[PDB]
Design a binder for this molecule. Structure first.
Ligand code: DMA
Lengths: 191, 191
């Protein structure tokens, strides 16, 4: 209905539609990236993969194949009924090898779901969210120039979370994190 | 200071500062508008005022003196330690005499506070807000073209609420509502 149409018209009016694909070279070894680079699952156990510098070795993260150094961009992710997932953006310069907390101070702007029902923003400390309708599809919205990262229910247009406006250092990558083994993959919607 | 600075630079990149004054001709007869038209209080009982067509006769509402038919606008409101208030925008065509529920379907976009601690967006159904620090000062952000109404803690830049993007009909007015008789006024910050 009207709320979906207005969500469509807003994203079209102001945000460059990103066509995002997963970069398997960056993916933590426990992650499985689909051949078409749209879908993300977790393996039972870490695969034997090279620890090249670009690969996340601690966090169960993967990046997109393109970064943003300017402009407004959006993309949508089919989270469906998956009980655990976090998505957003992170800086090129994040710690990929050693333990760090995924927080804006450490260069990550992400939100998501734990244990089926606990929505959080990964602020420091974590922000417990109240979500009246669990999203099946999440829109990720970036405005580089104003330091804005926001998240919507892409089916009904309802707002989920907006980080405080910040200042970004260097390129921002789409980032995806899953900690659990379960049937429903994360799937990127094509532009 | 960084969150405050980014909030300031965001308002400057995108939103025209509105210099909002209260129109006493619109004010429910239980409301008092200050001589400088920036402050709002509540009377013990309705005062004797003309029932001109613009006046809210049921709802404890008052409008700004200027409407918006286009563009990006913000204003900030000092709610201070008030236990109760609602602010936002409404259409020119809202029902002013009969009761109507203050919902987007009826042409009202407001959030506020009840009972000192219950923050709500007056969506339908109402959205329970979780607010980590009670705001003293609230920024109201309108984008007419994309049908966007959003609200921020104007002192730390944290986001409070964004309504689903919608389609506005006709001019929008700043609206302000207080239901309680309590020591702290509602006061508009000058541009
Ligand atoms: C691989 C792994 C156990 C990461 C989760 O990080 P965390 O326990 O600090 O939690 P979160 O980032 O979800 O707050």
């Amino acid at each position: 209905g009207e709320k979906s149409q207005a969500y469509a018209e807003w994203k079209k009016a102001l945000f460059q539609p990103a066509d995002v694909i997963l970069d398997p070279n960056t993916a933590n070894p426990i992650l499985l990236v689909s051949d078409d680079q749209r879908s993300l699952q977790r393996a039972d156990e870490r695969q034997n993969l090279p620890d090249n510098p670009e690969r996340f070795d601690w966090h169960y993260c993967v990046l997109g194949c393109k970064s943003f150094t300017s402009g407004r961009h959006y993309w949508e992710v089919e989270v469906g009924d998956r009980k655990e997932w976090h998505i957003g953006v992170c800086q090129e310069n994040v710690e990929r090898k050693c333990w760090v907390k995924m927080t804006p101070e450490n260069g990550f702007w992400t939100v998501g779901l734990t244990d089926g029902s606990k929505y959080r923003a990964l602020s420091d400390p974590r922000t417990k969210l109240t979500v009246a309708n669990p999203p099946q599809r999440v829109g990720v919205f970036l405005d580089y120039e104003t330091g804005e990262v926001s998240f919507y229910n892409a089916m009904d247009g309802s707002h989920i979370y907006t980080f405080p406006h910040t200042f970004f250092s260097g390129p921002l990558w789409p980032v995806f994190r899953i900690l659990t083994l379960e049937p429903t993959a994360l799937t990127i919607c094509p532009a």
